[PDB]
From a paper:
Acetylcholinesterase (AChE, EC 3.1.1.7) terminates cholinergic neurotransmission by rapidly catalyzing hydrolysis of the neurotransmitter, acetylcholine, at neuronal and neuromuscular synapses. The target sites of three of them, raised against the Electrophorus electricus AChE (EeAChE) subunit and named Elec403, Elec408 and Elec410, were identified using complementary binding, inhibition and mutagenesis approaches. Inhibition of the residual activity of the Elec403 complex by the positively charged organophosphate inhibitor, echothiophate, and the transition state analog, TMTFA, occurs at lower rates than inhibition of the unbound enzyme, while for the Elec410 complex only inhibition by TMTFA is reduced, and for the Elec408 complex both inhibition rates are unaltered. These features, along with delineation of the respective binding surfaces using mutagenesis of EeAChE, led to conclude that Elec403 and Elec410 are directed toward distinct but overlapping epitopes located at the enzyme PAS, whereas Elec408 targets a distinct regulatory site located in the BDR, and triggers a new inhibition mechanism. In conclusion, comparative analysis of a crystal structure of Fab408, which inhibits EeAChE by binding to the BDR, and of models of its Fab403 and Fab410 congeners, which inhibit EeAChE by binding the PAS, points to distinctive surface topographies and anisotropic repartitions of charges of their combining sites, consistent with their respective target sites at the EeAChE surface and the distinctive residual activities of their EeAChE complexes.
The structure of Fab408, the first known peptidic ligand targeting the BDR of an AChE, shows the canonical β-sandwich Ig fold and an elbow angle of 151.6° between the pseudo-dyad axes relating the variable (VH and VL) and constant (CH and CL) domains of the two chains. The combining site is formed by the six CDRs emerging from the Fab variable domains. In Fab408, all six CDRs display local pI values below 7.0. As a result, the ~1000 Å2 surface defined by the CDRs is mostly populated by anionic side chains. This electronegative patch confers on the Fab408 molecule a clear anisotropic distribution of surface charges with a moderate dipole moment of 484 Debyes and a vector oriented toward the H-chain N-terminus, opposite to the CDRs. At the center of the Fab408 combining site, the interface between the VH and VL domains forms a small pocket of 10-12 Å diameter lined by side chains from the protruding CDR-H2 and CDR-H3 and the shorter CDR-L3. On one side of the Fab408 pocket, the long and flexible CDR-H3, which encompasses a Glu-Asp-Trp-Tyr tetrapeptide (i.e. four of the six signature residues above defined) and a net negative charge, appears as a suitable candidate for interaction with the BDR of EeAChE.
Author numbering:
A (entry chain L): 1 to 213
B (entry chain H): 1 to 141, 144 to 224
The structure:
Amino acid sequence: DIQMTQSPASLSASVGATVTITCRTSENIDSYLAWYQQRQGKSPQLLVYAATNLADGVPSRFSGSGSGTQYSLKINSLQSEDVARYYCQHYSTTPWTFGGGTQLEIKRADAAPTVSIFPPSSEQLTSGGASVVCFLNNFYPKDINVKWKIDGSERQNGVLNSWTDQDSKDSTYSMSSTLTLTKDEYERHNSYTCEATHKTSTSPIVKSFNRNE
Amino acid sequence: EVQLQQSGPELVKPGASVKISCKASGYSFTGYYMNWVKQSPEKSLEWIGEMSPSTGRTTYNQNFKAKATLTVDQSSSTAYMQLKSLTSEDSAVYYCARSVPLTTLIEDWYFDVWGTGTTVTVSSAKTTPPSVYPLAPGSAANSMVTLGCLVKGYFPEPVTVTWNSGSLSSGVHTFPAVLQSDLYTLSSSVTVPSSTWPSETVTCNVAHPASSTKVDKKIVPR
């Protein structure tokens, strides 16, 4: 098995930038190499074959080069629709193998999160469960940390977080954090706080509600 | 024009087998090789093997020799892949992918058209329908208001969420599902002008095909 190593794992650049992704192989593959793009939630598409041949219909800002054990994919004037994972693949000796992928993001201006917090619904409380949800929406850069506080004490157990991929219109990220408790433990307390650290604020971003007040 | 329509998502028990289909359109099916690729949850890509739809001739990645069997039906322009004795390692998205014509002297073995993908889940966890919970504020009159739906305690993936039957799509954030103890939680937020809510209806629509369930939840104040 030929090892295909891509770098960097992650790339961030401004719209209009020229960017280069590299693929290093364990053997001289004599340019028997393909590049693919895959957008979130979509099937891959072919960009380049024989290391340097642009697949038909592919935008001309894409190009490939290389020889021996080192190959590159280049995008001139990066566009927001270029946000995707990129993979190299050899077809030199069987079995054909792929690199681990490179994820490209658009670099934009810092954006502070819009934070909303929700107490459990009456519906959920009837089941004997209680989820508190925090949305942290439309922020940039992606780096964020969320902590939950109950009556001021940090709570870590029962916390589930997920992040959207970068937005195709505004290039921001959003995050959702859900703390699930029992109805019983939820009712023993008053103050529920979603607390974030993000580069757009010096101090922690604090969103709370009082059950009830 | 060239399309490769694959079969639906699968939940299979950790001993069973599954057969995936790949229907070809807009080209001469028996004129080009057909390949299969695994994509692990970690988003790595693995070549499983190749089949010739014309002659039945086949080449496997030796790592999949015990796992995969590739088959064909020329009458319907459909290629198949069966995966035997499934384990957690086999939970993945599987793609069929077209390569070059059988008449190529050229040495270019690229995958130029990829299928729609078939997600395979292997586990002993029980199919469970979603609970859908409304997320509404308690603040009255920002100029924008954020509403949400929390979809909890379901298995397997996928759940799909729309707002107002898809007619409300700007300002929506639907978050990737998170697994805990064999059950998923997903959320979705929607931001609307405060002039439009609560004076107008906002509903999240949740579909969970695995459990044959659709839920609508109107978001009301308080």
